[PDB]
């Protein structure tokens, strides 16, 4: 039983302040299952590594790990390692990538939560890459699948959620949320649920 | 003083086994009043009757695509779109040819959660997505509270269309991954996060 060999980076898909890393697991687990992945990254030139741990089962199902806290139009070096019952294995070779220039924000992530009533719902906003400049506000569109769209809801950048009230009981609804900054509007995140 | 819309234009078609994603641009001229719906029409090579389906405009606009369903695997089709507004249906787009993929693993399932009134439970309805051209035999469900270890995989019996998560931790965030599996294999995982009260 030994620590895993090094995983290898397939490709990196960077945005403005974050990057998506696709990788292949180590060819030798070492005897015991891979528990976590550790990513190290820093701007080319810097001498201090930034790091983040990622759950292995999650990385396998998602198919990637996302690095955050980067700056626009900047060249970065990233590397990975795997942790098993024995410890951290060999670090991979570093892969270099350049983040996108300042642009429209990425789609935000939506997380449902029980609202004030059964015919209600709290849609939490899991903030995503803002594109390099502060998001100015969130645009929200929603409707019951059976009827017409409700007027658009505008939320300030500070908002951590959006509340949809007075909904029909046990009916299906769909929600779209757009994050907009100075550069433009992001793609729409869509969320479907049943009250 | 308004007029029906001009014709939409199909950029490209990304097909699967029994469905296809149609990427298109909205009509250049709306005509004067907001486009309300899009009408998609498709006909398999050889067949003579055009199948059709209405799609909500706003919905389609936000995703950039309309999804045609009920197609046969390994089959060549022709598809076209038209827009409807206050004045009526506009010009039909040119027809676009595409061929569905052969039978394979299912595409990631669609997840529709129904928050539990008890504040610590949830019903995840499995909305029908492309099955790859072969019936889904089992839905595999992996879930955990972001603060904890994964719970054992829950394999649902063929036929089931939902999974119920109860007795959940309070004030906790949960991630759920659902895999559709048929004769040819497992789909990539569909997922979503939710929070207990």
Residue numbers in the entry:
A (entry chain B): 497 to 691
B (entry chain A): 496 to 692
From the paper:
Our structure is of the shortest isoform (linker sequence TQPVREPSAP), whereas the underlined arginine residue is replaced by QG, HSPPPQG or even longer sequences in other variants. In agreement with our earlier prediction, the FRM and FGL loops are indeed located in close proximity on the same face of the wild-type NCAM molecule. Intriguingly, the corresponding loop regions are in close proximity in the acutely bent conformation observed in crystals of the wild-type protein, suggesting that they are part of a larger FGFR1 binding site extending over the domain junction. The neuroglian tandem, which has an extensive domain interface that incorporates a bound sodium ion, adopts a conformation that is intermediate between the two conformations we report for the NCAM tandem. Thus, a similar bend in the FN3 linker(s) may be a general feature of other animal CAMs containing FN3 domains in their membrane-proximal region.
The neural cell adhesion molecule (NCAM) is the prototype and founding member of the immunoglobulin (Ig) superfamily cell adhesion molecules (CAMs). NCAM is present on the cell surface of neurons, astrocytes and oligodendrocytes, where it mediates homophilic and heterophilic cell adhesion. We conclude that the NCAM–FGFR1 interaction at the cell surface may be transient or stabilised by avidity effects resulting from receptor clustering and that conformational changes within NCAM may have a profound role in FGFR1 activation.
